[PDB]
């Protein structure tokens, strides 16, 4: 579902991402910006302020895991449904996460990439990354029933 150029645009920027630091930032802002999401991360500890969320060890650890699975999706970009099938079952069956919340994380991730890359984050690089986050959200929703 991505053109050859779009793939270049995405893989091109992702190679420059600090997947360690970007993961905690994106999950952190998820919890700050859309605070209802904190309800799912109860066992992470103190989330009582933007400052507590952003320095929370568990937020950072989980953020890294979230961004590794996003990297695995970019290898398997032509079979995103297949790559995320196990994770889709988990979020449905065990975690009871409404899939609308996947769209929120994607856009927060897009905001964080724009924060880091500035002018380098073209309107056109943005578009290709919207297709990707949409594809991931859709694939995570696919095993819900």
């Amino acid at each position: 579902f991505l053109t050859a150029e779009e793939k270049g645009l995405v893989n091109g920027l992702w190679g420059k991402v600090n997947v360690d630091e970007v993961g905690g930032e994106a999950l952190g802002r998820l919890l700050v910006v859309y605070p209802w999401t904190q309800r799912f991360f109860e066992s992470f500890g103190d989330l009582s302020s933007a400052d507590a969320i952003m320095s929370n060890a568990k937020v950072k650890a989980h953020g890294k895991k979230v961004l590794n699975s996003f990297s695995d999706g970019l290898k398997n970009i032509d079979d995103l449904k297949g790559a995320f099938a196990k994770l889709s079952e988990l979020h449905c069956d065990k975690l009871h996460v409404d899939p609308e919340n996947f769209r929120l994380l994607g856009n927060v991730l897009v905001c964080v990439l724009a924060h880091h890359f500035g002018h380098d984050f073209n309107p056109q690089v943005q578009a290709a990354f919207q297709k990707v986050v949409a594809g991931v959200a859709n694939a995570l929703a696919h095993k819900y029933h």
Binding site: V110, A114, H116, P123, Q130
Partner: protein, 141 residues
């Protein structure tokens, strides 16, 4: 619904944007048309091509309304009344389209003002953009 902390984060940030608001208004539209092509269905009388004068002029108009929203955060419905009638009654823009724009507004700001775009201001602006977009879609029957 907003808050004293939100209002001040918005006011402080929109002070930083300053004379650039018109430029960012245009980039945000450009970003929305690019990323969300269905938004173009409401602009069929626009030359939508890249760098077009019509998109830039419209970007400025979008940025002035938002600047006036910053001054009337405590009475958005009254300050935005003409634009509510325009968007919800005359044009009938589907609310999903305001989500796309709001997002592209956030992205534009983070590109240009990384230092001001903190997790706390990010949240406040999202709250602000959605409150503006709420008022703008009110009259839909």
């Amino acid at each position: 619904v907003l808050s004293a902390a939100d209002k001040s984060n918005v006011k402080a940030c929109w002070g930083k944007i300053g004379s650039h608001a018109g430029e960012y208004g245009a980039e945000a539209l450009e970003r929305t048309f690019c990323s969300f092509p269905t938004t173009k269905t409401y602009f069929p009388h626009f030359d939508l091509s890249h760098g077009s004068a019509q998109v830039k002029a419209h970007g400025q108009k979008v940025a002035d309304a938002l600047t006036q929203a910053v001054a009337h955060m405590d009475d958005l419905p009254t300050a935005m009344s003409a634009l509510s009638d325009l968007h919800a009654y005359k044009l009938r823009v589907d609310p999903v389209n305001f989500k796309f724009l709001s997002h592209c507004l956030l992205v534009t700001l983070a590109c240009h003002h990384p230092a001001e775009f903190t997790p706390a201001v990010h949240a406040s602006l999202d709250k602000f953009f959605s409150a503006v977009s709420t008022v703008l879609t009110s009259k839909y029957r």
